[PDB]
Amino acid sequence: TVIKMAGMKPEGEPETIGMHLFGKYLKELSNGKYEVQVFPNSQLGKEDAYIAATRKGIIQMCATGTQTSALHPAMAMLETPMLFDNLDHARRAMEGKTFDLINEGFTEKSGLRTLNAFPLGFRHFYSKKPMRMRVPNIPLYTNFAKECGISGQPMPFAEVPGALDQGVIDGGDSPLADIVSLKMYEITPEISLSGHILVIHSLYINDKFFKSLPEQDQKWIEEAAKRSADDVWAMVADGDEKAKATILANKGNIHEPSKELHEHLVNAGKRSWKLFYDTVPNAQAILDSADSYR
C-alpha cells in the first residue's frame, strides 16, 4: 500500500527529515506492507494545495504547521509567541495536555488527524542590516508583525528564495534550519536572535483513510509518527548550535537585540495573544496548560 506525503521544506530540514524517518519506521513496523513516498519542498504544491489534497484523500498524508489554523483557529496556538521558555518546555506541552486541548475538535472540522508535534526551531531575524520583512501568510504571523511595528510582506515559504534574490525585501525571521538551508546569510547576513516563536509542525493523515485501516495498522502509523517526532525533538538543539557557528564562520553576523528592543518584542508578543482570545474559545485553558509545564 502506497502512502503519499507532501511537505513544504527542503531536504536536510527537520520537517523533511521527520517525513523520511516516519516512512522508514512505518515500513519497519508494518513489515514492508506500507511504503511511503515523500514529496518535500512543495513538490506537490504549496501548503494550501497539498492540505486540500490531503483533506480530499487525493494524497494520504502531509507535513505542515499552523497553516492549518485556517481550518481550526486553536491550531495557531501551537506557535503562541513568547509561550515556551525552551524546547524542553515546549516538548512537555506538546506531548501533554496543551496539544490535546488545541487538537480537540480539529479532525471534525478538517477531515485530518494530527499524528504528532515536533519543532523546526525558534525563529530569529535575518536582514541586510542589523524595512520590508517577509512574513508567512498566516494570521498569527501578519498580526504579530504589526504588533512589532514591522511592515510585513506575506508570502509562502516556497517564494522566499526568489524574494531574497529579487532584492526588494530586506529580511524576515525563520528558524535557523531554514536560514542555513536557503543560505539566507549570503544575502541577508545579519541575524538577530529573538526566538519570539517556536515553529511546530505535524504529520497529518487523511482521517477517512486512517480509520479505514486495521486497528493494528493504525498503531504502526501512530508509533512511526511518535518515533519520528521524538527523533526531531532530539536533533534541533544540536543543529541550531552548528547553524550559529556556520553563520559566524561565513561572513554572517549574530546580534543581540538591545534591552529596549527585546522589551518591544516581548510586549508585542503578549499583545498578539488578543488574536487568540478573540478567535479561540478555550484560549485561556490552552495557555494555562502550557504554563503548567513550565
Ligand X SMILES: O=P(O)(O)OC[C@H](O)CO
Annotated binding site for sn-glycerol 3-phosphate: 9, 66-67, 79, 123, 134, 201
Decide if 78 contacts 102 (C-beta within 8 A).
yes
Decide if 18 contacts 72 (C-beta within 8 A).
no
* Cell numbers representing residue 79 in the block: 506557535
Residue 257 CB coordination number (10 Å):
16
Q: Cβ 220 to ligand X, closest distance in Å? A: 26
Nearer to ligand X, 16 or 174 (CB): 174
Residues interacting with ligand X, by CB under 6 A?
65-67, 79, 136, 138, 157, 174, 199, 201
Nearer to ligand X, 34 or 204 (CB): 204
Sorted by sequence, the CB contacts under 8 Å of residue 251 that are 6+ apart come out as 185, 189
* Cell numbers representing residue 181 in the block: 538551508
Q: Is 243 helix (H, G, I), strand (E, B) or coil?
A: helix
Nearer to ligand X, 126 or 157 (CB): 157
The CA-CA-CA angle for residues 59, 62, 63, to 5°, reads 170
Nearer to ligand X, 21 or 177 (CB): 177
Q: Cβ 213 to ligand X, closest distance in Å? A: 27
Q: Cβ 207 to ligand X, closest distance in Å? A: 21
Listed in order, strand segments (DSSP E) in 49-104 are 61-64
* Cell numbers representing residue 6 in the block: 507532501
Q: Which residues are annotated as a binding site?
A: 9, 66-67, 79, 123, 134, 201
Residue 10 CB coordination number (10 Å):
17
Q: Cβ 218 to ligand X, closest distance in Å? A: 26
Nearer to ligand X, 42 or 206 (CB): 42
